[PDB]
Scaffold this active site. Structure first.
Site, PDB file in Angstrom:
ATOM      1  N   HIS A  28      10.984  56.665  15.717  1.00 62.00           N
ATOM      2  CA  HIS A  28      11.183  55.244  15.977  1.00 62.00           C
ATOM      3  C   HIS A  28      11.394  54.950  17.456  1.00 62.00           C
ATOM      4  CE1 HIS A  28      15.535  56.104  16.255  1.00 62.00           C
ATOM      5  NE2 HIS A  28      15.608  54.937  16.870  1.00 62.00           N
ATOM      6  N   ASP A  34      11.569  60.553  10.251  1.00 61.37           N
ATOM      7  CA  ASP A  34      11.737  59.877  11.537  1.00 61.37           C
ATOM      8  C   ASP A  34      11.861  60.884  12.681  1.00 61.37           C
ATOM      9  OD1 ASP A  34      12.020  57.980  13.484  1.00 61.37           O
ATOM     10  OD2 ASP A  34      13.788  57.010  12.623  1.00 61.37           O
ATOM     11  N   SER A  68      19.730  57.867  21.389  1.00 55.33           N
ATOM     12  CA  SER A  68      19.141  58.661  20.320  1.00 55.33           C
ATOM     13  C   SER A  68      18.397  59.858  20.898  1.00 55.33           C
ATOM     14  CB  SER A  68      18.193  57.806  19.483  1.00 55.33           C
ATOM     15  OG  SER A  68      18.887  56.736  18.866  1.00 55.33           O
TER      16      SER A  68
END
Lengths: 52, 161, 161
Positions: B39, B61, B113
């Site tokens: 993502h 993901d 992230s």
């Protein structure tokens, strides 16, 4: 022409579905530093032939 | 002592991802595979790592690729054991209780992230994706490992950082 | 102590192989079988060893033969256990981490093929064929033994020495 085109469409769809099923079955094994389970390697052909 | 070693490993094994001039995530080298959440969008701030072919899987993901030969010695080492206790992190310490990763202060920020969660021995355990705000704490939506299987753990209400 | 014993064992269990007057590889005595890498070319500097019938196998890149009776006492003792940690070597100490044999020094040079990799108690673990340039390190391509089987571990990009 119609019959031939329908047959080609069906065979292409089946081949694409087989390829997608192979990719979906062998996708988690490239996200780990692990083995490919030669039992599955024999049935499900993959790009790594000898390495990994 | 542990902090210095962890920072050295993070310096030698973590790369920022640049997109439109702003950092969006981090790509880490674990074992022999490049790691990056799917993502998160951008390009690796590294000429060698930018040209690799990435294998995307939206179910977990995560996007992975085989690391180049000459960066193999500059990559972290991993494990699949998660005993109860505490684990190190770049933003402090994380509490692992009942199969849950929890942030004591809720100090996580968007764009962070891709920062691995380390073990007590300097090994990598899991890769973070986002956090869910549970009161004062903040549970972590993280990508952890079995012996050979990637499992994506996502608490309710998680937001992708 | 350990270094002196290891070098004495290497002196007693290594025979130079010279081609055109210059050495290119080494053949070592392990257990009760003469072992030499197949890819190297030359003849063993020993009347008894050079006259034997060397079995060939290209898959493992190894040559094997049965030793005569009067050199049985001059042969190393083998093993199959490979715990994680440090192992001795002629050019230093080698490190076993994550199913790989790596060189701390990174000074691998052609002509060192065939030299056994030794254990703490003087036992032999594997046989050196070549290495792959891991930047500051190199990952060794070695031939080890299982309980009853031979395996070859070759990291990507390895070059024969």
């Amino acid at each position: 022409v119609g019959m031939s085109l329908l047959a080609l469409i069906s065979i292409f769809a089946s081949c694409y579905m087989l390829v997608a099923a192979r990719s979906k079955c062998l996708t988690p094994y490239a996200l780990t530093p692990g083995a490919a389970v030669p039992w599955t390697l024999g049935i499900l052909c993959c790009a790594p032939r000898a390495h990994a | 002592k542990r902090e210095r070693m962890c920072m050295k490993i993070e310096n030698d094994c973590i790369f920022e991802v640049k997109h439109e001039g702003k950092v969006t995530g981090y790509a880490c080298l674990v074992g022999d595979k490049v790691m990056k959440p799917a993502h998160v969008k951008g390009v690796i701030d590294n000429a060698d790592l930018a040209k690799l072919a990435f294998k995307k899987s939206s179910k977990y993901d995560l996007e992975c690729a085989q690391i180049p030969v000459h960066m193999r010695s500059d990559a972290s080492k991993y494990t699949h054991e998660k005993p109860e206790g505490h684990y190190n992190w770049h933003h402090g310490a994380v509490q692992y209780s009942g199969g849950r990763f929890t942030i004591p202060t809720g100090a996580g920020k968007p764009g962070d992230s891709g920062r691995p969660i380390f073990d007590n021995k300097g090994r990598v355990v899991a890769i973070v994706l986002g956090g869910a705000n549970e009161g004062s704490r903040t549970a972590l939506s993280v990508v952890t490992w079995n012996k050979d299987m990637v499992t994506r753990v996502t608490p309710e209400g998680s937001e992708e950082w």
